[PDB]
Design a protein around this ligand. Structure first.
Ligand code: 63D
Ligand code: 63D
Lengths: 352, 352
């Protein structure tokens, strides 16, 4: 079952040995494999592996499975860990990040820098489909597996776009393709602070690839199309909202435990923000507008101090409990003991 | 035939309405479509469309074509034009470009910056595979087409990696995962200034997606695996070299015609550099090492002086004629009239 962590070496080396079939001077090949080995190890290891665990479990509890068929599923499982590694490198470039899984972000290393990092997220991304071909080309589900990766990816790209631009000038007129020189001054848009817009962003940014895709993958590989998928997809949207709100909470509340340091500085629409904005006073809205989305520690400190004043922790647990219950309620209306066993177990182990 | 200029709006709108049926608010939906309309139009238009045209021609000259079949072939043609959109957004980030196709580089605009640009190369790259599916799900060549796009993209990712790092320290060691502070100053490595290495870089960075892929897509659609594909691969390699070397020679010899600003400044391994290193005395080798790769006006003027002095235009004319001959010679060993003509057309229209 969770031996999964051991087959990592063979899926990474399967792809490295494909690179090594290229017509290149033997000296270049040694430099190529040395660089890309560190690219895969540095950025795929060190996670909780929840999304990969999720595939292996759904595969087993939809359900007698020989060792040849566990190889195909462990490949899907690592393909989703690779997929998150490629999201991490991109996010850390995009969000001017500093620390990830308690190491320097990949793009900050002066031996790689941005130029290499941008090129590396596309290598990692494409390595997924190569692994999928190498291990599943002859399955009946091959075309649908790669269509689920492609479509889940598209959705989280759109979700990443919204997360980055929800507050920007071009969403409050016309993109000026002649301005390379007046850098927009980031500012909140009070008209966008609400949960309708939050769920739109976070469903797309989190729920499809962290939950819909690993489940649907585990089920396409087992043999299932059926009207159960749409019920799985609704639970997914609930677990994605529930996971992202927890992630927003962690951003402001310990880097040693989370492994990261940024949402106020980066002018993001977050749960702590929409919470504060509905309960605070009219003076307090003016301070939020004035200080949100700057790099001043003084401006961040103002926003953090407001989050304590209004005790947003207490509100979080209120949300967490009510939502945990809404997910369990949604799992039980699914009518499938095996998959219901995986989702409940996952719901317990999501943050550990 | 070359009417495929007219079909752009429908393949672009095809992808845009895939996004437009996402579960998002109505106001959010229209912001997305306004931004991604400009994304496609800014970066797929304004080029010469040599790769797109090559697909349409090869398809027609391997053969009797109905309207439905043209709608598929012109999809593959814009897919490769979108592919080259993604390759620019990315090449211009990594090389800090200023002008691409007589406009500002996409990442340089203040409404997009680097954070949106990185996210946009993944959207453009992935939109290709949505388009191929919409129009080719039910064709027998469908899987062969998606795999050709994938293995081509992988090779140019590797070539672009070598092009970026052949002169850096890690290619002369190991990567310091502790260094985020001491930046690497760009320098020349004389062990890498040879045509063996350059052919490795250029073939991967250019030959596969610029030639092999658009030709293979044409043939696959036409129904042909066969040993002719191996012959197309070596032609492709001779034409990739030919085309990059011409590009190199234009970098020193006007943004009116080329549409872009920089190889000396940017420490690039180019054919002028390699040739000049063969012909020159070793006191001039020392000048090169001292002046190449410096963001300094005196320094590129010294390297320019050296290209003029060792008569680089005269040697480019020689190379160009001998290489053109060897490509025509390979073309004739094809033993297929329709492709031979297209490759003769292409070899004449390459710079126009
Ligand atoms: C294949 C990439 C194609 C281009 C994609 C560009 C957009 C990528 C967007 C990824 O978006 C994210 C948004 C977020 O709010 C957070 C994250 C990161 O979430 C994490 C979640 C988990 Cl469970 C874990 S883990 N592996 O330590 O257990 C890690 C991350 C993480 O950032 O490391 C990514
Ligand atoms: C799907 C992208 C995944 C990440 C890829 C990162 C690396 C992208 C590398 C693209 O590599 C190139 C290498 C080169 O030496 C040159 C180029 C561009 O060359 C051009 C040649 C021509 Cl004829 C033309 S055009 N369409 O304007 O008539 C354009 C390009 C081009 O710059 O667009 C791209």
């Amino acid at each position: 079952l969770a031996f999964f962590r051991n087959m990592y070496d063979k899926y990474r080396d399967a792809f490295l040995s494909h690179l090594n079939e290229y017509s290149l001077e033997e000296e270049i090949k040694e430099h190529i494999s040395k660089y890309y080995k560190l690219l895969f190890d540095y950025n795929c290891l060190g996670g909780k592996n929840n999304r990969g665990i999720l595939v292996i479990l759904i595969y087993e509890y939809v359900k007698d499975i020989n060792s040849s068929e566990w190889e195909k599923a462990a490949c899907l499982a690592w393909c989703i860990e690779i997929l998150q590694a490629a999201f991490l490198v991109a996010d850390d470039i995009m969000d001017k990040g500093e620390m990830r899984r308690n190491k320097y972000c990949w793009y900050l290393l002066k031996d790689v820098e941005t130029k290499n990092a941008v090129n590396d997220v596309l290598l990692l991304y494409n390595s997924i489909y190569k692994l999928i071909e190498i291990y599943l080309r002859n399955e009946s589900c091959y075309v649908d597996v790669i269509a689920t990766f492609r479509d889940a990816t598209l959705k989280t790209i759109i979700g990443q776009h919204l997360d980055t631009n929800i507050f920007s000038d071009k969403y409050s007129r016309e993109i000026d393709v002649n301005n390379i020189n007046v850098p927009e001054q980031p500012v909140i848009d009070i008209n966008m602070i609400n949960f309708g817009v939050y769920k739109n962003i976070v469903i797309h940014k989190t729920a499809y690839y962290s939950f819909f895709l690993p489940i649907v993958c585990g089920m396409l590989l087992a043999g299932i199309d059926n009207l159960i998928y749409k019920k799985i997809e609704d639970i997914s949207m609930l677990m994605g909202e529930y996971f992202q709100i927890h992630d927003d909470y962690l951003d402001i509340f310990d880097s040693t435990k989370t492994g990261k340091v940024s949402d106020i500085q980066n002018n993001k629409l977050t749960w702590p923000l929409i919470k504060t904005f509905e309960l605070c006073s009219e003076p307090d809205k003016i301070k939020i507008v004035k200080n949100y989305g700057k790099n001043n520690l003084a401006c961040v400190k103002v926003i953090d101090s407001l989050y304590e004043q209004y005790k947003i922790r207490k509100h979080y647990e209120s949300y967490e409990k009510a939502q945990k219950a809404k997910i369990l309620s949604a799992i039980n209306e699914l009518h499938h003991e095996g998959i219901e066993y995986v989702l409940k177990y996952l719901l317990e182990i999501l943050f550990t």
